[PDB]
């Protein structure tokens, strides 16, 4: 499967009258989920749970109301799987992948923010045709190209391609030139943006060089972050 | 197959 970050505390019980929420994001077969653990550290039960997202850069929104039938009792912990889609209202956020959230129960409402890893927004149909790749790489202005060092990665090309493909980043071509592997890759976001990539792998260097071309180059740093996470994990 | 391997090798060459 694709890379899933370990759950992080998004709402600590000290800030939320005893309610702790830890979470992560998954994306299996195009279905995006916010996977959470709610823990009641308090002395009273908790009921009447609901959640709301603020508008955000990629229009992420829950697909259903929160799934919680019975009271969450003192010292109880439950796993909550919230399906999301990208058909919701859009507002540019800073950082670009910031999500503002409000969760309420019977005691209060609690606001927090978390970061959506961009890889959960990589769609399954993100393999560019080869002819189109060549034309697009030429056509996108060279001033849009941004380069990044993926440091202390020493996986071979085949392993890199496989890990990336498992995360919907497709290898369109692989060439060996002057003893260096050059991997040409594509991916597409849920909002239709294509990113094209060249990944350079040498004997000699500890670091791979990632060059990214995108018509919205603001997204490139976030793509780098998740390349780095996928290849390191 | 699609004949385009040579074009990709030229692209790679042009950037080294």
Swiss-Prot record, chain A:
Q: Name one GO cellular component term.
A: endocytic vesicle membrane
- Transmembrane ranges, per UniProt, are none
Gene Ontology BP, a term = intracellular protein transport
How the protein is affected by changing residue 145 to A? Strongly reduces interaction with LDLRAP1, ARRB1 and EPN1. No effect on DENND1B-binding
PTM comment: Phosphorylation at Tyr-33 by SRC occurs at the plasma membrane in clathrin-coated vesicles (CCVs).
**What is known about the tissue distribution of this protein?**
Expressed in the brain (at protein level).
What GO terms are given for molecular function? clathrin binding; protein-containing complex binding; signal sequence binding
Where are the Phosphotyrosine residues found in this chain? 33, 224
Superkingdom, according to UniProt? Eukaryota
What are the boundaries of the region Interaction with ARRB1? 137-233
Subcellular location(s): the record lists: Cell membrane; Membrane, Coated pit
Assigned keywords, A-Z: Acetylation, Cell membrane, Coated pit, Endocytosis, Membrane, Phosphoprotein, Protein transport, Transport
Q: Return the similarity comment.
A: Belongs to the adaptor complexes large subunit family.
Q: What does this protein do?
A: Component of the adaptor protein complex 2 (AP-2). Adaptor protein complexes function in protein transport via transport vesicles in different membrane traffic pathways. Adaptor protein complexes are vesicle coat components and appear to be involved in cargo selection and vesicle formation. AP-2 is involved in clathrin-dependent endocytosis in which cargo proteins are incorporated into vesicles surrounded by clathrin (clathrin-coated vesicles, CCVs) which are destined for fusion with the early endosome.
Subunit annotation: Adaptor protein complex 2 (AP-2) is a heterotetramer composed of two large adaptins (alpha-type subunit AP2A1 or AP2A2 and beta-type subunit AP2B1), a medium adaptin (mu-type subunit AP2M1) and a small adaptin (sigma-type subunit AP2S1). Interacts with EPN1. Interacts with EPS15; clathrin competes with EPS15. Interacts with SNAP91; clathrin competes with SNAP91. Interacts with CLTC; clathrin competes with EPS15, SNAP91 and PIP5K1C. Interacts with LDLRAP1. Interacts with AMPH and BIN1. Interacts with ARF6 (GDP-bound).
Q: What is this protein called?
A: AP-2 complex subunit beta
Organism of this sequence: Homo sapiens (Human)
Gene designation:
AP2B1
From Swiss-Prot, chain B:
For the motif [DE]-X(1,2)-F-X-X-[FL]-X-X-X-R motif, give the residue ranges. Answer: 6-15
The record's domain comment reads:
The [DE]-X(1,2)-F-X-X-[FL]-X-X-X-R motif mediates interaction the AP-2 complex subunit AP2B1. The PID domain mediates interaction with the NPXY internalization motif of LDLR.
Give the UniProt tissue specificity note.
Expressed at high levels in the kidney, liver, and placenta, with lower levels detectable in brain, heart, muscle, colon, spleen, intestine, lung, and leukocytes.
Q: Please state the gene responsible for encoding this protein.
A: LDLRAP1
Instruction: Tell which residues of the whole protein are contained here.
Output: 252 to 267 of 308
Q: What's the protein name?
A: Low density lipoprotein receptor adapter protein 1
Subunit composition and interactions: Interacts (via PID domain) with LDLR (via NPXY motif). Binds to soluble clathrin trimers. Interacts with AP2B1; the interaction mediates the association with the AP-2 complex. Interacts with VLDLR. Interacts with LRP2.
| Domain of life assignment | Eukaryota
What is the disorder linked to it?
Hypercholesterolemia, familial, 4: A form of hypercholesterolemia, a disorder of lipoprotein metabolism characterized by elevated serum low-density lipoprotein (LDL) cholesterol levels, which result in excess deposition of cholesterol in tissues and leads to xanthelasma, xanthomas, accelerated atherosclerosis and increased risk of premature coronary heart disease. FHCL4 inheritance is autosomal recessive.
The subcellular localization recorded is: Cytoplasm
């Amino acid at each position: 499967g694709g890379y899933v970050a370990p759950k992080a505390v998004w709402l600590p019980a000290v800030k939320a009258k005893g309610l702790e929420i830890s979470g992560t994001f998954t994306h299996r077969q195009g279905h995006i989920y916010m996977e959470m653990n709610f823990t009641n550290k308090a002395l009273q039960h908790m009921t009447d749970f609901a959640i709301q997202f603020n508008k955000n850069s990629f229009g992420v929104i829950p697909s259903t109301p929160l799934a919680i039938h019975t009271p969450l009792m003192p010292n109880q912990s439950i796993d909550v799987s919230l399906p999301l889609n990208t058909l919701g209202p859009v507002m540019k956020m800073e950082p670009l992948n910031n999500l503002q959230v409000a969760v309420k129960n019977n005691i209060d409402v609690f606001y927090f923010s978390c970061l959506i890893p961009l890889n959960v927004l990589f769609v399954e149909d993100g393999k560019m045709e080869r002819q189109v790749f060549l034309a697009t790489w030429k056509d996108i202005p060279n001033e849009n190209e941004l380069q990044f060092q993926i440091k202390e990665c020493h996986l071979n090309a085949d392993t890199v391609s496989s890990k990336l493909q498992n995360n919907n980043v497709y290898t369109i071509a692989k060439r060996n030139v002057e003893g260096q592997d050059m991997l040409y890759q594509s991916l597409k976001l849920t909002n239709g943006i294509w990113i094209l990539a060249e990944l350079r792998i040498q004997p000699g260097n500890p670091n791979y060089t990632l060059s990214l071309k995108c018509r919205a180059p603001e997204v490139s740093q976030y793509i780098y972050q998740v390349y780095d996470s996928i290849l390191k994990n | 197959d699609d004949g385009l391997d040579e074009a990709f090798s030229r692209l790679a060459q042009s950037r080294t």
